[PDB]
Amino acid sequence: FQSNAMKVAVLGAAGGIGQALALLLKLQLPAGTDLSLYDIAPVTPGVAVDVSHIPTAVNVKGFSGEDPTPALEGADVVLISAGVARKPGMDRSDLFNINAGIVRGLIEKVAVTCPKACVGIITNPVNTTVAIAAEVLKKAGVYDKRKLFGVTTLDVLRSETFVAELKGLNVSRTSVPVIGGHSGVTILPLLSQVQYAKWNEDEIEPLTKRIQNAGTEVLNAKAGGGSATLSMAQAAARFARSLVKGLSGETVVECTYVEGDGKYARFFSQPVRLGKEGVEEILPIGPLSNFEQQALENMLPTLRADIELGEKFING
Amino acid sequence: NLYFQSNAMKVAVLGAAGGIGQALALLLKLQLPAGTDLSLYDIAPVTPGVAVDVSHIPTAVNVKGFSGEDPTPALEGADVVLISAGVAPGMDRSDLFNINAGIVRGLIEKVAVTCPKACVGIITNPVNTTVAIAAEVLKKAGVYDKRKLFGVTTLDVLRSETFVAELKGLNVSRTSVPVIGGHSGVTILPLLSQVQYAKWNEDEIEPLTKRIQNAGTEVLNAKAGGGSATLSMAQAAARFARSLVKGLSGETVVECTYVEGDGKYARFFSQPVRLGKEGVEEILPIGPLSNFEQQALENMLPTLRADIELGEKFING
Numbered sequence: 001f002q003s004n005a006m007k008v009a010v011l012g013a014a015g016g017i018g019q020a021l022a023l024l025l026k027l028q029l030p031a032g033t034d035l036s037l038y039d040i041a042p043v044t045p046g047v048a049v050d051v052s053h054i055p056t057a058v059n060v061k062g063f064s065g066e067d068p069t070p071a072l073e074g075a076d077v078v079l080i081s082a083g084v085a086r087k088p089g090m091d092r093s094d095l096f097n098i099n100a101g102i103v104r105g106l107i108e109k110v111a112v113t114c115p116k117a118c119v120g121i122i123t124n125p126v127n128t129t130v131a132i133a134a135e136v137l138k139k140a141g142v143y144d145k146r147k148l149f150g151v152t153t154l155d156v157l158r159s160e161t162f163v164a165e166l167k168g169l170n171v172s173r174t175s176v177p178v179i180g181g182h183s184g185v186t187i188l189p190l191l192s193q194v195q196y197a198k199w200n201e202d203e204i205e206p207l208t209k210r211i212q213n214a215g216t217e218v219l220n221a222k223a224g225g226g227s228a229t230l231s232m233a234q235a236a237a238r239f240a241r242s243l244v245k246g247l248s249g250e251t252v253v254e255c256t257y258v259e260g261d262g263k264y265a266r267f268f269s270q271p272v273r274l275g276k277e278g279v280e281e282i283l284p285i286g287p288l289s290n291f292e293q294q295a296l297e298n299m300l301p302t303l304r305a306d307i308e309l310g311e312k313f314i315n316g
Numbered sequence: 317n318l319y320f321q322s323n324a325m326k327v328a329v330l331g332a333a334g335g336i337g338q339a340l341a342l343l344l345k346l347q348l349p350a351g352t353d354l355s356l357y358d359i360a361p362v363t364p365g366v367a368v369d370v371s372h373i374p375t376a377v378n379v380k381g382f383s384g385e386d387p388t389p390a391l392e393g394a395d396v397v398l399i400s401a402g403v404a405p406g407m408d409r410s411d412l413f414n415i416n417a418g419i420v421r422g423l424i425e426k427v428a429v430t431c432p433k434a435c436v437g438i439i440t441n442p443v444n445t446t447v448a449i450a451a452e453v454l455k456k457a458g459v460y461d462k463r464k465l466f467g468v469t470t471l472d473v474l475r476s477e478t479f480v481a482e483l484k485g486l487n488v489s490r491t492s493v494p495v496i497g498g499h500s501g502v503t504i505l506p507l508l509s510q511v512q513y514a515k516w517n518e519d520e521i522e523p524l525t526k527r528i529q530n531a532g533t534e535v536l537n538a539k540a541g542g543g544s545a546t547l548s549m550a551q552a553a554a555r556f557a558r559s560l561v562k563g564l565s566g567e568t569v570v571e572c573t574y575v576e577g578d579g580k581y582a583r584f585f586s587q588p589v590r591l592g593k594e595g596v597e598e599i600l601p602i603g604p605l606s607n608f609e610q611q612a613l614e615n616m617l618p619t620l621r622a623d624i625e626l627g628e629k630f631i632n633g
Contacts, residue, residue, distance in 0.1 A: 019339075019546075019547060020338075020339060020342060022547065023339060023342075023343075023547045023550070023551070024342075026547075027551065041542070042540035042542070043539045043540055043542030043543070045538050045539075045540075046535055046536075046537075046538035046539025046540060046542060046543070047539070047547070048538075049534060049535050049538040049539075050535050050538075050539070050545050050546060050547045050548050051547050051548065052478070052548075053471070053474055053475045053478055053531065053535070053545065053548040054474060054478070054547075054548050054551050055474055055477040055478045055481060055488045055489055055491070056488065056489060057488050057489065062538075154372070157372055157373055157374055158372050160374040161371070161372055161373065161374045164374065170376075171374045171375060171376050172374060172375060172376065174374070214372060217368050218365050218368045218369050218372075219365070220365070221364045221365035221367070221368040221381070222362045222364070222365025222366070222368070222369075223361040223362055223364075223365065223383075225361075225362050226362050226365055226366070226369075228369050228372065229338070229369060230338060230341070230342040230345075230366070230369045230370050230373075231369050231370065231372040231373050233342070234342065234346070234373050
């Protein structure tokens with residue numbers, strides 16, 4: 001069952017993101033929480049042993065091989081960070097090319113073993129991989145709209161970080177709502193809703209563009225070889241932390257990609273109140289500036305098409 | 317001069333591209349106090365991008381990355397220098413050493429010139445030896461300060477805290493276990509007899525002490541030849557860096573660490589050390605030992621002295 005000692009499962013724990021996430025979870029999760037780390041690579045048991053030497057009351061266990069079932073049994077939260085992250089040769093293309101199958105394979109296991117878990121899709125491209133997860137869950141007859149999330153949190157860290165620097169605000173207490181999708185023109189930070197910031201029309205377009213293209217700053221600084229591994233892990237840990245709090249009865253609100261009312265797109269990221277069933281209430285986006293309003297209408301076709309790509313991968 | 321006194325604390329990580337380094341830069345971005353500057357350096361060209369990666373995390377810690385053959389920009393004004401460069405599967409201990417000993421020498425040569433008054437924490441293995449190496453390089457430049465050179469043994473401490481807490485039902489985040497001696501094999505000596513609230517049967521001592529001493533190998537084997545401990549090692553380093561930053565900032569802390577002390581047992585030896593504004597403020601005594609610990613200490617010295625000798629020879633002769 002669920003809801004006694006909280007149980008968190010990480011599928012993709014051997015990758016760059018996964019290992020970093022495992023570390024943060026060991027240090028951040030509540031005492032008593034069970035942490036199951038899974039990946040195909042035989043190194044995974046060793047990753048868990050490595051993390052288990054850190055003195056926190058989080059119980060960590062390792063799993064490898066073809067079947068993630070032992071790691072998923074009784075899972076409350078399932079974080080999927082398997083597959084590849086962007087790199088030099090990889091465009092929107094290569095991520096979907098490799099990660100579409102991986103996601104499907106893992107979600108099929110989740111649908112059988114722990115269908116009532118809150119599922120956090122970190123693996124990119126999120127706009128599409130979430131639709132893949134949904135369709136797989138629907139085929140198995142266990143899809144719960146309240147428990148499937150596209151982890152868009154890295155766009156929030158980035159927006160908070162760049163906004164605080166530019167406007168001289170407290171970097172750790174500056175809330176910036178971000179809506180839409182988790183890629184390119186689909187990422188829309190709502191700068192007009194940020195408190196204590198007076199915006200010249202001049203700085204709106206460049207800041208938005210910097211938030212949207214932030215991954216490229218890393219990709220170019222890393223001289224190609226590497227993506228945003230460390231910030232992605234922190235974004236995932238922060239989201240996981242919010243999920244666990246919602247499940248534990250503590251109200252938290254996070255902007256995340258979920259199947260909402262479909263006003264703009266079947267799946268869409270917006271403020272969500274998290275609770276005991278995962279989503280408790282999908283909140284409105286609130287008032288938008290002319291700029292933000294236009295950016296929203298302009299992303300719709302791209303966002304819808306990203307979703308249709310994931311749907312068609314499962315439904316043909 | 318009674319009022320306000322600012323503080324532009326700076327921490328540099330040499331070897332920020334490896335497994336340990338990247339995890340360490342993440343933890344330091346998250347754990348260092350607001351306003352601290354974090355400099356990352358490694359010959360690997362990816363380093364500047366590692367820094368851009370962590371710079372997207374919303375904390376008031378400014379981070380910059382540097383690559384190339386010159387770590388100078390990374391060391392300028394540094395208060396704390398953590399050296400995790402070099403290599404950790406499928407290699408003889410003598411095969412690595414020659415590679416790592418050289419890299420440590422090269423980096424300490426720059427430290428001596430650019431930031432000689434910085435506290436230097438050596439993570440790169442074998443620590444028993446690499447520390448002697450750094451000490452001799454600093455001495456050649458006439459800047460070796462005993463109070464500012466440390467062998468980071470903190471991981472033996474985390475392991476000791478964790479194994480003891482779990483075996484004896486104690487609070488894992490509130491269990492203190494002193495670890496003395498060195499950072500490798502028989503030289504790692506956890507003082508189990510000084511652990512509060514733990515009743516030991518004589519037969520539990522040997523296997524638990526061996527578990528702590530052989531923890532590295534257990535991770536090495538468990539990773540199926542995919543590497544050594546990296547994640548727990550980054551956290552050990554983060555904790556030691558956090559302690560150095562506290563001491564320098566005027567906050568008294570005590571950490572078991574490998575330093576040049578009274579030389580009662582060996583030139584360099586790990587023991588409790590009160591940290592302060594000059595690095596080492598006072599090197600405290602090991603305290604009372606059980607018969608087992610006293611024997612383990614005596615049986616271990618020849619190996620520890622030889623590890624030190626090797627590091628001195630690498631530089632002097």
